[PDB]
Paper text:
The peptides CA/p2 P1’F and p2/NC were successfully crystallized with MDR 769 in P212121 space group. The CA/p2 P1’F-MDR 769 and p2/NC-MDR 769 co-crystals diffracted to 2.10 Å and 2.30 Å, respectively. By superposing the MDR-substrate complex structures on corresponding WT protease-substrate complexes, the substrate backbones were overlapped in both the MDR and WT complexes, and only minor conformational differences were noticeable in the long flexible side chains. All five [name] variants had higher probability of forming complexes with the CA/p2 P1’F peptide. The presence of CA/p2 P1’F significantly slowed down the processing of the FRET substrate. Especially, the NL4-3 and MDR 769 were completely occupied by CA/p2 P1’F, and the fluorescent signal maintained as the base line of background signal. The IC50 values of CA/p2 P1’F pseudopeptide for NL4-3, MDR 769, MDR 807, MDR 1385, and MDR 3761 were 2.6 nm, 4.4 nm, 16.0 nm, 32.5 nm, and 55.4 nm, respectively. The corresponding relative resistance values were 1.7, 6.2, 13, and 21 fold, respectively. The desolvation energy changes for MDR proteases in complex with CA/p2 were higher than that for the WT complex. The higher unfavorable desolvation energies of CA/p2-MDR complexes explain the resistance to the uncleavable CA/p2 reduced peptide.
Four clinical MDR [name] variants, MDR 769, MDR 807, MDR 1385, and MDR 3761, were isolated by Palmer et al., among which MDR 769 exhibited resistance to all the tested inhibitors and was successfully crystallized. The four MDR [name] variants exhibited resistance to all US FDA-approved [name] inhibitors, and the substrate recognition ability is also reduced in these proteases. MDR 769 adopts wide-open flap conformation in the absence of ligand. However, the peptide binding results in closing of the MDR 769 protease flaps as is the case for the wild-type protease complex.
Residue numbers in the entry:
A (entry chain B), B (entry chain A): 1 to 99
C (entry chain D): 1 to 7
Amino acid sequence: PQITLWQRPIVTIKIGGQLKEALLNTGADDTVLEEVNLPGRWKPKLIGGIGGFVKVRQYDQVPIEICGHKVIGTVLVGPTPTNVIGRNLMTQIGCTLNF
Amino acid sequence: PQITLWQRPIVTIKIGGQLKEALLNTGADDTVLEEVNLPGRWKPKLIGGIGGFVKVRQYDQVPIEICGHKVIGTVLVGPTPTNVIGRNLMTQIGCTLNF
Amino acid sequence: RVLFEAM
């Protein structure tokens, strides 16, 4: 699809069997969700935003479905204001910016 | 252009008569730059992201050029870690996400 | 909001 930017570009994601929604975010290296049902091990990591740096949980090799495209990648769980899909996953669904 | 997301989507901009670079940020409602020479009045504003809030100066109807495309819109200036182009300007140049 | 994020 071709998605304009008059509103937040939010799409449906599926993760650990749950429907969530997340913002396609070209300004994020990484994918960050507030809360997942992934039951296993994670590694403590830190990310930075405009305001400073925060602790996240890093989950590796996560099956995740974006907008009906099935991918595998790294999902971070952290204190983000809204779920964001980063470039790490957007590259895998062949997402580009165009003008 | 068509911009893939394997690296950060950084483009050239021109504002207050200076060439800068800035990140195409579909996860930013607003456009924020670390420094600029602009004329006329600003009003104070707070913006939120990962890791807290930033205090900025808001300038309205500012002429900007993004990859050569001339656009007019609101620019925020403050101590961001990186120059960011938000949706408020990306819509002006017809930027879309495509997959 | 400005959701720049970098790790």
